[PDB]
RNA sequence: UGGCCGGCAUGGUCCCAGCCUCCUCGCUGGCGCCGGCUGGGCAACACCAUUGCACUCCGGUGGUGAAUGGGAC
């Protein structure tokens, strides 16, 4: 069951060995060309390592992402790319 | 020594270099041998497990069972 577009992209398959503040940082070096990036929300804890939460000010920086990015060399491992089931706090608070 | 004890061995104080280490990374730390008890913490590092949808920080285990020489008095 596929999830429909969202804001916030979800991405996993990511290199756990990877420290939470250089993850992010190297991140938004690759992402920050699809749009305003409005937050970045990554966890090494058991249930949330190798996966980040990509949060994007429109839908269609998102949808971009996705399909440029799907299977992305990033830390010698392909990123895996969706989007995330659910809208992230910070758009919310908006939309 | 992270805290603590037992046995044995061992002239001294320095000075230069090199090396070691999860627990005060460096020159007013340490770098003989053997045995036993034991605390903290996953922060770093390693290993094991994990492919996982969050917006509440949060899996486990291991390391000292370590490290040489030279010189001056
Ligand atoms: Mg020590
Ligand atoms: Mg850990």
Same mark, same amino acid.
């Given at each position: !069951?596929? +999830? $429909? !577009?969202?804001?916030? %992209?979800? %991405?996993?398959? /990511?290199?756990? *060995?990877?420290?939470?503040?250089?993850? *992010?940082?190297?991140?938004?070096?690759? @992402?920050? $060309? @699809?749009?305003?990036? /409005?937050?970045?929300?990554?966890?090494?804890? /058991?249930?949330?390592?190798? =996966?980040? @939460?990509?949060?994007? *000010?429109?839908?269609?920086?998102? +949808?971009?992402?996705? $399909?440029? #990015? =799907?299977?992305? !060399? @990033?830390?010698? *491992? !392909? #990123?895996? %790319? =969706?989007?995330?089931?659910?809208?992230?706090?910070? %758009?919310?608070? #908006?939309?």
């Amino acid at each position: !069951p596929e +999830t $429909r !577009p969202n804001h916030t %992209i979800y %991405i996993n398959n /990511l290199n756990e *060995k990877i420290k939470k503040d250089e993850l *992010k940082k190297s991140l938004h070096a690759i @992402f920050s $060309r @699809f749009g305003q990036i /409005l937050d970045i929300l990554v966890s090494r804890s /058991l249930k949330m390592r190798g =996966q980040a @939460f990509v949060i994007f *000010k429109e839908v269609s920086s998102a +949808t971009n992402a996705l $399909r440029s #990015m =799907q299977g992305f !060399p @990033f830390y010698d *491992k !392909p #990123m895996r %790319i =969706q989007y995330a089931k659910t809208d992230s706090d910070i %758009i919310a608070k #908006m939309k």
